[PDB]
Amino acid sequence: PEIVDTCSLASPASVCRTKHLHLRCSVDFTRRTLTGTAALTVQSQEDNLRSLVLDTKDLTIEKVVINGQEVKYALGERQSYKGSPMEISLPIALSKNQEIVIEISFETSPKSSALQWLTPEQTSGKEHPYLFSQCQAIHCRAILPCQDTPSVKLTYTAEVSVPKELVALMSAIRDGETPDPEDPSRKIYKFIQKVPIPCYLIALVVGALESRQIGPRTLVWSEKEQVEKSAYEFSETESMLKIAEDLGGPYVWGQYDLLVLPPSFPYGGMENPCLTFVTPTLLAGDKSLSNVIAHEISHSWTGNLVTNKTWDHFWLNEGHTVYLERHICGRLFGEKFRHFNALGGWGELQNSVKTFGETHPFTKLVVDLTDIDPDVAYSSVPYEKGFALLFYLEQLLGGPEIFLGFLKAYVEKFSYKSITTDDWKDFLYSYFKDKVDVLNQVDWNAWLYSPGLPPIKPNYDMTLTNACIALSQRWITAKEDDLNSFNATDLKDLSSHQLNEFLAQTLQRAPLPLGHIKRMQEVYNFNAINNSEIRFRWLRLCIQSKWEDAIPLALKMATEQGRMKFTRPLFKDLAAFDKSHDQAVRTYQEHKASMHPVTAMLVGKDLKVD
Ligand SMILES: C[C@H](NC(=O)[C@@H](CC(=O)NO)Cc1ccccc1)C(=O)O
Ligand SMILES: [Yb+3]
Ligand SMILES: [Yb+3]
Ligand SMILES: [Yb+3]
Ligand SMILES: [Zn+2]
């Protein structure tokens, strides 16, 4: 069974493996560089090992030290988004299982794709700068030299020097703080991660952060202006951790803290161990976007404990996490609610497949990422096709209680390891050996490796969806003389989730006639709704239906936050509207230099600019 990581230029785990990183760096805001040493404890997996190769991207290497002396190394030629391989010549050949420590002195580039450096103007407080990282999938190599593949798990410690007014946090347990001996305007924050993790989980923030406690093992961190609102928004967090522990087994990471990032954070959430990062666009005021916390919590088992061996197997991380996310929300709010969210996810899958096209290779569950940048291929597919496959399997094999038994056993089986789809499938067959005849009914080749919508759609309870579908059908089939029958009372029995689903249904049939959209604004006043998911879908419906009044609203939401879920389609829709096209491109050009580097790249590709 031969499997190597095609996104990594480092020596693979079969040659050598990193066991520990001790990181000592200083955050230089004047220069937008992180400077320090990465000491890697590396274990040879081979006899007579004399060299090894590490991933780097846009790093400046000052030197490499083993056994107190400088050693030879060479940087290869850059291999586009993969970066440049660093070969290091070991001073003494290693036997199998021998471990050494390699200390690499390095400096990042200001344009590190792992990092966003924010001026004071780009923060809430307006007095201090801010830095955050995002290493998933393959940007850890833009921060430090490493075997940048999830097929290798290491523990880590780190000492981070920062201006003394600021606070540093990491994906790790805080292990104290002191004044910096070599510069008193500074502080050193120390950190310890005792659980082996893939390098994509290394995370760093530095900024003017304050914390508030919201449960026995949870602090919320943000700038001061966001603290009170974040505490309320994420108050279900401890109750979700308890349900998750019930489903997954023991939470092993100690703390579960939340960090609410500035608005340019590119994702809804990122499951950094001990410190989940979230977008401030979750702060709807009513806890209605909390499925995102349920999702990040669930990664504490599926993803951070049982990890995909390479990114071709990313659905293992996300499809399982969505399956557990939806169970948490099902426990809190009922089984009809789990089916409603499950049925919504099928529609998001329809969208993604329609968008790439039904034979596009990114619509496959297991993807081949050789020479594909993971950020380009990134979509809802591994989430929703992965969830669809699990929910189909749940229904085939006897229901949620039985399938949840399999999930817990799966996590116990593969804790602290990195696995492939074939490892998952083999264990699925082993666990359900008394139901192999059922298992053999599944069209594995189609579910796993075929493009498009899955060969079979699961059964979904429709109770909560029906009202959404009816209202959306009323609007789609309305003629001019029917617009007067709509009224704000149409919405009185719909939850925010149902309103969001009404908009998703209607957006799938966009455009609507412009008079319909204007009437919808007259009677429902969707312009007033600040809930980001609902506002996103409503602005998209308005732009796709060619409402000029919506252009400044859509542009302002595209640029005042940077969650890619929202920014990328808003910009794409604005460019596809002839009236807003020149402005969409201009606004992108003007904002580009102060955007997140990955977001800037993808919006550029979407708009075909550069
Ligand atoms: C498209 C994008 N997706 C994410 O941010 C997900 C990232 C993730 O998988 N974290 O674990 C986390 C997530 C999971 C489920 C719902 C929303 C967000 C987004 O929502 O902005
Ligand atoms: Yb300690
Ligand atoms: Yb009529
Ligand atoms: Yb150009
Ligand atoms: Zn996830």
Closest CA to 228 of 214, 248, 244: 214
The answer to whether the CB of 65 falls within 8 A of the CB of 106 is no
Contact by Cβ (8 Å): 305, 549 = no
* Cα pseudo-dihedral 190, 194, 197, 203, rounded to 10: -20
> Phi first, then psi: what are they for 228, rounded to 5°?
-60, -45
Q: Tell me if 152 sits within 8 A of 198, measured CB to CB.
A: yes
How many Å apart are CA 533 and CA 482, to the nearest integer? 28
Quickly count helices (H) and strands (E) in the chain.
19, 22
Cβ of residue 319 lying under 6 Å from some atom of ligand 1: no
Place of tokens 């591994």: 382
Structure tokens at 104: 């690499």
Catalytic pick from 159, 236, 296, 394?
Answer: 296
Distance CA 142, CA 9 (A): 13
Angle between helices 400-414 and 381-396 (to 10 degrees): 120
Question: Using CA atoms, how far apart are residues 180 and 172, in angstroms rounded to an integer?
Answer: 20
Whether residue 572 contacts residue 580, with contact meaning beta carbons closer than 8 Å, is answered with no
* Closest ligand 1 atom to Cα of 563: 21
Q: How far is CA 184 from the centre of its chain?
A: 37
**Residue 158 has which token pair?**
């780190």
**Does the annotation flag 266 for ligand binding?**
yes
Beta bridge partners of 40: 21, 102
The angle, 0 to 180 degrees and rounded to 10, between the axes of the packed helices 581-591 and 564-576 is 140
Ligand 1 centroid, distance to 483 Cα (angstroms) = 36
| Alpha carbon distance 532, 556 (integer Å) | 12
Q: How far is the CA of 340 from the centre of ligand 1 (A)?
A: 18
Catalytic residue among 73, 323, 383, 410: 383
Q: Is 61 left (phi over 0), alpha (psi -120 to 50) or beta?
A: beta
Q: Other C-beta atoms within 10 Å of 110: how many?
A: 12
**Cβ 149 vs Cβ 310: under 8 Å:** yes
Instruction: With H, G, I as helix, E, B as strand and everything else as coil, classify residue 243.
Output: helix
Nearest to 263 by CA among 575, 599, 602, 496: 599
> Cα separations (Å) of 226 from 231, 288, 297, 380, 538?
9, 17, 21, 29, 26
Distances (CA, A) of 71 to 41, 105, 486: 16, 12, 75
Rounded-to-integer distance, Cα 488 and Cα 496, Å: 14
Task: Give the whole-angstrom CA distance, residue 341 versus residue 356.
Answer: 23
**Token pair of 75 as six digits:** 């940087």
Q: Is 267 in the pocket of ligand 1 (CB under 6 A)?
A: yes
Pick the closest to residue 230 from 245, 216, 211, 248 (CA basis): 211
Tally of CB atoms within 10 A around 466: 11
With a 6 A CB cut-off, is 387 part of the ligand 1 pocket?
no
Q: Is 269 annotated as a binding residue?
A: yes
CA-closest candidate to residue 286, choices 540, 488, 530:
530
Residue 278 sits at φ, ψ, to 5 deg, of: -135, 155
Contacts of 72 (CB under 8 A, 6+ apart): 64, 88, 89
CA pair distance 317, 197, nearest whole angstrom: 14
Beta bridge partners of 54: 86
Handedness of CA 118, 119, 123, 128 (dihedral sign): positive
> Which ranges of 334-420 does DSSP label H, i.e. alpha helix?
335-356, 374-377, 381-396, 400-414
Structural tokens at position 150: 């999830």
Structure tokens at 293: 């916390």
Of the candidates 442, 489, 437, 441, the one whose C-alpha atom is nearest the C-alpha of residue 467 is 489
User: Would you call 143 helix, strand, or coil by DSSP?
Assistant: coil
- The span from the CA of 78 to the CA of 287, in Å, is 45
Tokens of 320: 């399982």
Residue labelled with tokens 């939850």: 495
The C-alpha atoms of residue 29 and residue 27 are separated, in whole angstroms, by 6
Question: What does the alpha-carbon distance between residue 44 and residue 64 come to, in Å, rounded to a whole number?
Answer: 18
To one decimal place, what's the resolution in Å? 1.9
Q: Check if 423 has its Cβ closer than 6 Å to any atom of ligand 1.
A: no
Four-residue CA torsion sign, 35, 197, 270, 233: negative
383 catalytic residue (yes or no): yes
Instruction: Return d(Cα 98, Cα 50) in angstroms, integer.
Output: 12
Strands (E), 126-246: 130-133, 153-163, 167-170, 173-179, 186-198, 204-207, 210-215, 218-222
CB 10 within 8 A of CB 146: yes
Please tell me the distance from the alpha carbon of residue 12 to that of residue 2, in angstroms, as a whole number. 12
296 is catalytic: yes
**Cβ atoms 479, 322 nearer than 8 A:** no
Helix H or strand E encompassing 264? none
Q: Is 564 helix (H, G, I), strand (E, B) or coil?
A: helix
Contacts of 582 (CB under 8 A, 6+ apart): none
- Of all ligands present, the nearest one to the C-alpha of 480 is 3
289 lines ligand 1 (CB under 6 A): no
| Tokens read off for 401 | 């209680």
Which region, left, alpha or beta, applies to residue 456 given φ > 0 means left and ψ of -120 to 50 means alpha? beta
Q: Best substitution site from 265, 279, 282, 292 to test ligand 1's pocket, by max atoms within 8 Å of Cβ?
A: 292
Crossing angle of helices 335-356 and 381-396, in 10° steps, is 130
For residue 511, whether the previous peptide bond is cis, meaning omega lies within 30 degrees of 0, is yes
* Cα→Cα distances 292→29, 255, 258, 276, 489, Å: 31, 18, 12, 10, 30
Helix pair 400-414, 237-248: axis angle to 10 deg: 80
Strands 269-270, 275-278: pairing is antiparallel
Q: Which residues are registered as beta bridge partners of 184?
A: none
Centre of ligand 5 to C-alpha 271, Å, is 7
Question: Who's near 479: CB < 8 A, 6+ residues apart?
Answer: none
The DSSP result for 590-608, as a single string, is: HHGGGS-HHHHHHHHHHHT
Query: 373 is written with which tokens?
Result: 């940048």
Tokens of 300: 């504490």
295 is in an annotated binding site: yes
Residue nearest to atom 15 of ligand 1 (CA): 292
Report d(CA 501, CA 512) in Å as an integer.
17
Ramachandran angles phi, psi of 488, nearest 5°: -55, -20
Record the tokens describing residue 402, joined without a space: 């039985």
**Spatial CA neighbour of 325 closest among 349, 311, 341, 307:** 341
State residue 532 phi and psi, 5-degree precision.
-60, -40
Phi/psi of residue 97, nearest 5 degrees: 80, -5
Joined tokens for residue 530: 């600040």
Amino acid letter, residue 121: E
Please answer whether residues 560 and 570 qualify as being in contact, where contact means their C-beta atoms are separated by less than 8 angstroms: no
Distance of alpha carbon 194 from alpha carbon 191, whole angstroms: 10
Measured from the CA of 566, which atom of ligand 1 is nearest? 21
Cα 365 to Cα 305: distance, rounded to the nearest angstrom: 21
Neighbour count for residue 435 (Cβ, 10 Å): 14
Q: What gap in Å lies between CA 174 and CA 159, rounded to an integer? A: 10
Cα 128 from chain centroid?
26
Q: Among all chains, which residue has been given the structure tokens 């404890």? A: 41
Q: What does the alpha-carbon distance between residue 405 and residue 407 come to, in Å, rounded to a whole number?
A: 5
DSSP 491: G
Task: Give the amino acid at 281.
Answer: T
For 509, the token pair is 């049939």
Helix (H, G, I), strand (E, B), or coil: what is residue 588? helix
Six token digits for residue 578: 């002839």
User: What burial letters (b/e) apply to 331-344, b meaning 16+ CB within 10 Å?
Assistant: bbbeeebbbbbbbb
Tokens (6 digits) for 368? 């081949």
Question: What amino acid occupies position 244?
Answer: A
Query: How far apart are the CA of 479 and the centre of ligand 3, in A?
Result: 6
Token pair 């049939």 is found at 509
What CA–CA distance (Å, rounded) separates 239 from 278? 18
Closest CA to 141 of 106, 114, 109: 114
Please report the domains of the chain, with CATH numbers, ordered by start residue. 15-207 (2.60.40.1730), 208-304 (3.30.2010.30), 305-461 (1.10.390.10), 462-610 (1.25.40.320)
131: left (phi over 0), alpha (psi -120 to 50) or beta: beta
Q: Which residue's CA is the nearest one to ligand 1's atom 20? A: 268
Residue 373, strand partner residues: none
SS (H, E, C) 399-431: CHHHHHHHHHHHHHHHCCEEECHHHHHHHHHHH
Instruction: Tell me the two tokens of residue 39.
Output: 């000491």
Count of C-beta atoms within a 10 Å radius of residue 112: 21
CA geometry: angle 529, 530, 534, nearest 5 deg? 70
| Determination technique used | X-ray
Q: What three-state secondary structure class fits 23? A: strand
Q: Whose CA is nearest to atom 10 of ligand 1?
A: 270
